[PDB]
């Protein structure tokens, strides 16, 4: 890392605008791998909508109504989804998180197209709500779950992707950027292989949509996930994603309130896409307020915000490597983490690190992160992990880097 | 009504704690049955989760925990579930609207508990959100939708009771209070059938909990749902409480991140109850300002809140009597309505109607009230709906009246 570059990372020019880290000058939060700080127009966003438009024909639900609409807008165009050059916002859809979007794919897209014998891919790497929607699917419909798994440098080769996808696959299920080992996965080259084999590609961008670019349209898939809390949005929100003639497909999730055109006793006329997929009152505010988080990202550009995160992820990475207690849990090159770094100090269990991090204002997490099938598969049952947002400078790492010495200091091998 | 009880509803002691009334002094919003407006200490508690306690083992993390669990107990509380004297915290669980909440005890319930051949019964005045999951499971088990029908004053009579709950019936789902009627059911008599018959209990709370006591422990339901947007909580959360006992009979209904308690790459186990049905990154946020929305209530009084309600629906009834072109959907007698009169001005479509009635700053819902099999049984294709909230008073409903002759003077007879 030249002089500029530690130079940059030395500067914070985004902090201020995140009224809890101002507040709390002293707090390095490590954590946005689990949720992003708030930037202070998105939580006013919020307080706004409920103070001048908050309606469920007359005005304010004239005015919710656009909102809502403007929201999808900005949403589409941030990842891609654009004709013409008109946001897909019919292609948008809210959830209340990646989570729900996730089982509503199994759900819907898993009766659609799922037949007994059929192969689910989904990767080693994938989040608790990457596997456990498709273990039920499978179950309830006769297909088996297949996993992609790694090389020693972390990654999934072309060679594991052509040995597992094959002429059974019906659905592939694929993290774009690991919540642990921060390994961006190669989804353009899964999804060529996954339409060879007539098989829907569904991405879970839940940690790629705040720190790269997402552009649907080049990643070739079918349906993609995510989650507004962490690229500083609220949370309560969550989207998918589809291709417009595979959502018509799809059979609804949730029923009820909103999500029709009619209703008999006996049955019912579905709405068009996307109120088909958004049963009852939907959080407005908070669909607003990511708008709003949108157009902050928008306004700092997410070039400038990757270069930054990029910068940060390699000196994390750096000055753990000189830490010859430390055992990082995936990579050793900074370059091939985006976000996250997950680490132990050798003997020490995380509980016990972040217990001391905390107590010198470090925020880390602590556990399996949600992806106990990765951990397990690398002899690991929990780890630390550190992550980075364009918000934190290099002296919060050093912060880091500091509170792990007292950890050695303390449980260290001379104790 | 009294002299007394006129300068009651021409007082308004509520309003200015809501800063979209303060700051629209004009304007007479009657479709508080869609959604509330919000207190401004609501608007607040909201903000200052983010801003202050903002995380999903450290201190703000500790602290979010934290905040969930007292606004769990505060929910319990509210509706009775309590010990001891402890709040029965866990059998309260998080969705992101009364619909939500629906849809998961028809999956979860009806996967446990029906047969083929059993009967499902709710009732014609069900909403949208109480009647297609039930629509949409029973033809996944082989059970039979049964429909509870009302007499001539738009109630549930005993003897339609007995004789649609019968002992084929598995469970029976009855909203407490229409959001079109304003008919208060006899949900604990409903009840003692039900559960006589060997079924199970759901209620629809989402038009009673904003208005009347609601007590779970007395209602003897076994599973009951609302909606915080209705009783001037934040959008985006919705409540489900059940029997301790059923919750952990029931299975999960979404998957995923913080519903288990370990992941394997082909199964898994549960978390304990309320986790169990709470997958992924909750909207804290959202939560906390139910719980102080939950407080703002208790802080007025429930009690005055309902008196003064009752009050408004009597007058709002009674003035519209007084204009013989409007047709009441509904009883005629003011005390008979919790919240909401549905109507139309005869000869005028409800789009014209509420149309004016915006012009002139009156605020209606027109169309079906997401209650389309209600209106097909009272051969009607479309009403208007007017409500009322404590923070409503005389004006907002003379307002109304104002705009219904000016609506009369446009569309009726003489023209
Ligand atoms: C955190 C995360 C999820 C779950 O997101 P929620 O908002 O909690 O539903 C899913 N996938 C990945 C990769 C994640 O990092
Ligand atoms: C509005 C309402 C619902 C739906 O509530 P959501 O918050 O939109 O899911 C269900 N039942 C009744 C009686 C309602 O009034």
């Not at 985004?14 to 000058?25: E, M, R, T």
């Not at 919540?179 to 996954?194: F, Q, S």
């Not at 349209?217 to 507004?228: E, K, R, T, V």
């Not at 990029?310 to 830490?323: D, P």
Request: charged share 20%; net charge negative.
């Amino acid at each position: 890392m030249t002089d500029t570059e530690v130079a940059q990372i030395t500067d914070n020019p985004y902090k201020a605008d995140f009224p809890i880290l101002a507040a709390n000058p002293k707090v390095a939060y490590l954590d946005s791998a689990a949720t992003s700080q708030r930037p202070r127009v998105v939580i006013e966003a919020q307080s706004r909508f409920y103070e001048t438009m908050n309606a469920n024909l007359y005005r304010w639900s004239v005015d919710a109504t656009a909102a809502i609409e403007d929201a999808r807008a900005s949403i589409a165009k941030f990842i891609g989804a654009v004709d013409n050059d008109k946001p897909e916002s019919q292609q948008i859809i809210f959830t209340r998180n990646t989570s729900e979007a996730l089982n509503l794919v199994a759900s819907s897209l898993g009766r659609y197209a799922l037949k007994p014998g059929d192969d689910v891919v989904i990767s080693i790497m994938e989040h608790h709500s990457n596997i456990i929607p498709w273990q039920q699917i499978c179950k309830a419909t006769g297909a088996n779950l297949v996993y992609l798994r790694m090389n020693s440098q972390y990654q999934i080769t072309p060679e594991e992707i052509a040995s597992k996808i094959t002429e059974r696959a019906k659905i592939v299920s694929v993290t774009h950027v690991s919540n642990v080992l921060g390994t961006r996965n190669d989804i353009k080259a899964i999804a060529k292989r996954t339409h060879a084999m007539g098989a829907y590609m569904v991405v879970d961008a839940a940690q790629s949509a705040p720190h790269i670019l997402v552009n649907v349209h080049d990643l070739d898939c079918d349906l993609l996930a995510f989650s507004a809390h962490k690229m500083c949005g609220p949370m309560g929100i969550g989207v998918l994603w589809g291709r417009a003639e595979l959502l018509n497909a799809m059979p609804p999730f949730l029923t009820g309130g909103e999500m029709i055109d009619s209703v008999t006793e006996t049955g019912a006329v579905w709405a068009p896409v996307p109120e088909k997929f958004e049963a009852g009152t939907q959080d407005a505010a908070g669909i607003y307020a990511t708008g709003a988080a949108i157009k902050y990202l928008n306004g700092l550009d997410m070039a400038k915000i990757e270069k930054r995160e990029e910068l940060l992820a390699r000196y994390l990475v750096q000055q753990l490597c000189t830490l010859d207690f430390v055992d990082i849990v995936g990579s050793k090159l900074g370059q091939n983490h985006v976000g996250a770094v997950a680490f132990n100090v050798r003997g020490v269990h995380p509980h016990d690190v972040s217990s001391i991090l905390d107590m010198n204002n470090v925020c880390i997490r602590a556990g399996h992160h949600c992806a106990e099938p990765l951990l397990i598969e690398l002899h690991e049952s929990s780890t630390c992990r550190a992550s980075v947002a364009f918000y934190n400078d290099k002296h919060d790492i050093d912060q880091l880097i500091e509170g792990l010495n007292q950890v050695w200091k303390i449980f260290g091998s001379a104790v």
